[PDB]
Amino acid sequence: GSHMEDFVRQCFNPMIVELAEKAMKEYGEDPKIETNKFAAICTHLEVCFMYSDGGSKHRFEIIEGRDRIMAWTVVNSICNTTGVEKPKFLPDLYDYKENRFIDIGVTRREVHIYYLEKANKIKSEKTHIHIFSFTGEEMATKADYTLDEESRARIKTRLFTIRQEMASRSLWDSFRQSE
Numbered sequence: 001g002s003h004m005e006d007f008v009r010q011c012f013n014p015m016i017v018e019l020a021e022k023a024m025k026e027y028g029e030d031p032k033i034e035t036n037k038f039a040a041i042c043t044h045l046e047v048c049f050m051y052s053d054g055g056s057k058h059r060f061e062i063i064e065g066r067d068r069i070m071a072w073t074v075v076n077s078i079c080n081t082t083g084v085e086k087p088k089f090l091p092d093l094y095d096y097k098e099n100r101f102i103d104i105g106v107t108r109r110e111v112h113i114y115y116l117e118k119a120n121k122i123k124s125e126k127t128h129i130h131i132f133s134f135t136g137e138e139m140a141t142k143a144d145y146t147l148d149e150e151s152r153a154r155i156k157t158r159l160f161t162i163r164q165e166m167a168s169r170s171l172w173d174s175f176r177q178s179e
C-alpha cells in the first residue's frame, strides 16, 4: 500500500485508472508495485485523450486506450484504407486531416532527448512525434504541432499540476528519478 498508488486513484479519473490497470496487466505489471509506471500510464492516457479533444469533431481516430488486439485491428483498417505505411509500434492517434499516425510522449526530461529516443525507436519515418514535458515544453516532428496553441497549453498546464500534486506529497523526486 504505497502513497503513490492512492495518489494516482485520487488524481485521475476512474475510467483512466481502469484503462491504465488493464494496460499494465496485459504486460504482466502490477499497479501496486510498479507505482511510478501506473502514474505514468495514467498521465499518458489522459494527455492523449485531451489531445484528441483538440481536433475538429472527426479529426482523430483514437488508438491509445483500446485493447491491444483491437488497437492493431484499427491501425490495420487505417493502413488498408488510406495506403499509409503500417507502424512497427502502436501509435496513439491517427490524424485524418494530415493523414498520419501520431505518437504522443510525455517526459520528465529534456524533450529533445526523449524525442530522439522515440525517433530512433519507432524508425517509422512517417509516424508524427509530439512530446510534452512536465516543465511546459513541447517538441514536434517538423516543428508541426498539429493543434492550435490553446489545446496544447491546457495539456501543459495539467502536466504541471500533476507535478505540483506529486511534489506536495513528496512523490515527485522519486517519480522524476524513476523515468
Ligand SMILES: [Mn+2]
Residues within 6 Å of the ligand: 044, 092, 103, 104, 105, 106
Ligand atoms: Mn505515446
